[PDB]
Design an enzyme around this catalytic site. Structure first.
Site, PDB file in Angstrom:
ATOM      1  CG  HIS A  40       0.589  71.138 -20.126  1.00 42.50           C
ATOM      2  ND1 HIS A  40       0.286  70.100 -20.859  1.00 42.50           N
ATOM      3  CD2 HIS A  40       0.511  70.651 -18.801  1.00 42.50           C
ATOM      4  CE1 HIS A  40       0.039  69.067 -20.110  1.00 42.50           C
ATOM      5  NE2 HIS A  40       0.165  69.374 -18.857  1.00 42.50           N
ATOM      6  CB  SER A 177       1.579  66.733 -17.835  1.00 40.57           C
ATOM      7  OG  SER A 177       0.134  66.777 -17.826  1.00 40.57           O
ATOM      8  N   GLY A 178       3.751  65.421 -19.986  1.00 39.22           N
ATOM      9  CA  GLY A 178       5.121  65.533 -20.503  1.00 39.22           C
ATOM     10  C   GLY A 178       5.775  64.210 -20.724  1.00 39.22           C
TER      11      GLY A 178
HETATM   12  O1  LIG Z   1      -0.707  68.167 -16.671  1.00 36.60           O
HETATM   13  C1  LIG Z   1      -1.534  68.737 -15.719  1.00 36.60           C
HETATM   14  C2  LIG Z   1      -1.203  69.930 -15.030  1.00 36.60           C
HETATM   15  C3  LIG Z   1      -0.023  70.650 -15.144  1.00 36.60           C
HETATM   16  C4  LIG Z   1      -0.043  72.012 -15.479  1.00 36.60           C
HETATM   17  C5  LIG Z   1       1.127  72.757 -15.557  1.00 36.60           C
HETATM   18  C6  LIG Z   1       2.343  72.144 -15.293  1.00 36.60           C
HETATM   19  C7  LIG Z   1       2.396  70.802 -14.962  1.00 36.60           C
HETATM   20  C8  LIG Z   1       1.223  70.068 -14.883  1.00 36.60           C
HETATM   21  C9  LIG Z   1      -2.115  70.441 -14.126  1.00 36.60           C
HETATM   22  C10 LIG Z   1      -3.310  69.836 -13.870  1.00 36.60           C
HETATM   23  O2  LIG Z   1      -4.179  70.415 -12.955  1.00 36.60           O
HETATM   24  C11 LIG Z   1      -4.796  71.598 -13.453  1.00 36.60           C
HETATM   25  C12 LIG Z   1      -3.626  68.673 -14.536  1.00 36.60           C
HETATM   26  C13 LIG Z   1      -2.760  68.094 -15.465  1.00 36.60           C
HETATM   27  C14 LIG Z   1      -3.168  66.920 -16.082  1.00 36.60           C
HETATM   28  C15 LIG Z   1      -4.384  66.284 -16.150  1.00 36.60           C
HETATM   29  C16 LIG Z   1      -4.248  65.157 -16.864  1.00 36.60           C
HETATM   30  C17 LIG Z   1      -5.140  64.141 -17.195  1.00 36.60           C
HETATM   31  C18 LIG Z   1      -4.733  63.107 -18.054  1.00 36.60           C
HETATM   32  C19 LIG Z   1      -5.590  62.055 -18.404  1.00 36.60           C
HETATM   33  N1  LIG Z   1      -6.828  62.015 -17.955  1.00 36.60           N
HETATM   34  N2  LIG Z   1      -5.123  61.112 -19.183  1.00 36.60           N
HETATM   35  C20 LIG Z   1      -3.407  63.175 -18.547  1.00 36.60           C
HETATM   36  C21 LIG Z   1      -2.529  64.203 -18.203  1.00 36.60           C
HETATM   37  C22 LIG Z   1      -3.004  65.157 -17.364  1.00 36.60           C
HETATM   38  N3  LIG Z   1      -2.384  66.216 -16.881  1.00 36.60           N
END
Ligand SMILES: *[O-]C1=C(C2=[C][C]=[C][C]=[C]2)[C]=C(O[C])[C]=C1C1=[C]C2=[C]C(C([N])=[N+])=[C][C]=C2[N]1
Ligand SMILES: [Ca+2]
Ligand SMILES: [Cl-]
Length: 223
Positions: A40, A177-178
């Protein structure tokens, strides 16, 4: 990372920042020319930044390399985030030393209770946006599958695992993320999703890397 602490410059040498004019995702260096991140996080125009601590200041030890290609898992599903893993090949190999180094892939999956280190430059507030300049760390345990499934009923596949604290307060968040989930020196997870950040009973969900080691190996071997 919410509820975490400042890692300290270059204490996490396999951590990378994917940048397209700003930091948008983390990743892990697994060899001098390959990084693993989440599907993603895919986009074109990615510059991989190694040896970073403060992402807004060049302090030394940084290597900025363009991605030559990104390989999203063929069975990645953006609706469920099942198979949320991607490999990025670098235009040139990175110089490895003690500040930039690769992390090993696992030989076995980890068990609940295993303590891991999660890092990244993602949001540090569960209610609002506060992005740090330097790298944050969090030590969190892998949870049992029942607890994970009880928290996200119907949304956990066998390629996901939960890690964190059910009481809330400490978790990974957007911007993380990632990035890596390292346990006993092996890359066991990739920051994937969660409901909000650091909410009670809503742990973080990670891609279970032990299920993709043969795929990663075969894919790198043919590219
Ligand atoms: O990872 C992420 C994204 C995102 C999308 C596309 C490219 C890069 C990043 C967007 C986003 O807003 C819509 C939210 C995340 C995201 C939420 C979240 C929560 C947790 C958690 N609660 N442990 C871990 C990882 C992420 N990523
Ligand atoms: Ca920097
Ligand atoms: Cl279920």
């Amino acid at each position: 990372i919410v509820g975490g602490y400042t890692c300290g410059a270059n204490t996490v040498p396999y951590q990378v920042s994917l940048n397209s004019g700003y930091h948008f995702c983390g990743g892990s260096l697994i060899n001098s020319q390959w990084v693993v991140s989440a599907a993603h996080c895919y986009k074109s125009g990615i510059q991989v930044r190694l040896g970073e601590d403060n992402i807004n200041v060049v302090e030394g030890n940084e290597q900025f390399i363009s991605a030559s290609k990104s390989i999203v898992h063929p069975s990645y599903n953006s609706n469920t985030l099942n198979n949320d893993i991607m490999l990025i090949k670098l235009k040139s190999a990175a110089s490895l030393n003690s500040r930039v180094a690769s992390i090993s892939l696992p030989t076995s999956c980890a068990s609940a209770g295993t303590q891991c280190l999660i890092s990244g430059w993602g949001n540090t507030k569960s209610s609002g946006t506060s992005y740090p300049d330097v790298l944050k760390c969090l030590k969190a345990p892998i949870l049992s599958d029942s607890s994970c499934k009880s928290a996200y009923p119907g949304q956990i596949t066998s390629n996901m695992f939960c890690a964190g604290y059910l009481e809330g307060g400490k978790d990974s968040c957007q911007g993380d993320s990632g990035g890596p989930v390292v346990c006993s020196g092996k890359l066991q997870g990739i920051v994937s999703w969660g409901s909000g950040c650091a909410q009670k009973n809503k742990p973080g969900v990670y891609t279970k890397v032990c299920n993709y080691v043969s795929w990663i190996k075969q894919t790198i071997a043919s590219n």
